[PDB]
Design a protein around this ligand. Structure first.
Ligand code: 2QU
Ligand code: MG
Length: 285
């Protein structure tokens, strides 16, 4: 891509309102002027400090979004002013996974809902990993739902920055310490994040949620793998969490291996779950 040849978004796209009020920063519910179809628009300022980082988010989202579990790239635009870069993509109108769990009774999702959502996350990750892309910011806030209960991944912003985000979904290997100065990691760091996301769906919050983020950052590399608090869950669900949450990434399974895990592989009530999720989205709307 080249920032020079990009057109002005006037009469093509318009901003409606910010989405998630700061969760994603300068991200808006947008509208394709001519059709009225919604789009999510990421608005970044084209500063010299953040100009190469800005181009890279365009290029990545552009080539790696042609998969049903990743929100699709539409186009890039520059609104000349300090110039404003607009990154336009597919709008997912039913909120994030975090929203879904906080707007549910008892801040807990049914196990078969967790199995459905976790598989869609892993299918999106398998697409990224096969194209040598690590998502790097897997969390319930970056996993969105559409009106018809489809699950899509967002944010190539930190994909492989001046502000470090939330640390709760971060794998031990991405947190630098004395025996890990270079914070050496691979695609498996997203699988740990997927495991924390499944705990988040089961409990309504990631482990260490009650800690100061800086304290969680210190604790993640030294604490044993997090575990589900309740004993109610199936053996397969406990086994899936254990798979995602292997402390040492060197023996953590691959995305392909986790997709074959009985909890992810065996979903007999798939059809009903999709209907239940749709019903939940409609009853919240
Ligand atoms: N596609 C979306 N539809 C609805 N709401 C959203 C909220 C955030 C992001 C988001 C967050 C961070 N970086 C992005 F590129 C997009 N994308 C969407
Ligand atoms: Mg797509």
């Amino acid at each position: 891509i080249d920032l020079s040849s990009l057109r002005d978004p006037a009469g093509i796209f318009e901003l409606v309102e910010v989405v998630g009020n700061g969760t994603y920063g300068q991200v808006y519910k947008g509208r394709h002027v001519k059709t009225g179809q919604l789009a999510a628009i990421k608005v970044m300022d084209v500063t010299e400090d953040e100009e190469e980082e800005i181009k890279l988010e365009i290029n990545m989202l552009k080539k790696y979004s042609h998969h049903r579990n990743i929100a699709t790239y539409y186009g890039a635009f520059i609104k000349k002013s300090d110039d404003q870069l607009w990154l336009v993509m597919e709008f997912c109108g039913a909120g994030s996974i975090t929203d879904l769990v906080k707007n549910t009774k008892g801040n807990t999702l049914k196990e078969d809902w967790i199995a459905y959502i976790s598989r869609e996350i892993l299918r999106g990750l398998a697409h990224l990993h096969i194209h040598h892309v690590i998502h790097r910011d897997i969390k319930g806030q970056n996993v969105l739902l559409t009106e018809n209960a489809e699950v899509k991944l967002v944010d190539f912003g930190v994909s492989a920055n001046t502000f470090i985000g939330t640390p709760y979904w971060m794998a031990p290997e991405v947190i630098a310490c004395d025996e890990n100065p270079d914070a050496t990691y691979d695609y498996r760091s997203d699988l740990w994040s997927c495991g924390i996301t499944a705990i988040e769906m089961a409990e309504g919050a990631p482990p260490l949620c009650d800690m100061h983020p800086m304290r969680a950052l210190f604790l993640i590399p030294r604490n044993p793998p997090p575990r589900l608090k309740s004993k109610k869950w199936s053996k397969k669900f406990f086994s899936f969490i254990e798979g995602c949450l292997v402390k040492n990434y060197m023996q953590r399974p691959s995305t392909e291996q986790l997709l074959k895990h009985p909890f992810i592989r065996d979903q007999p009530n798939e059809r009903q779950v999709r209907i239940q999720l749709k019903d939940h989205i409609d009853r919240t709307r």
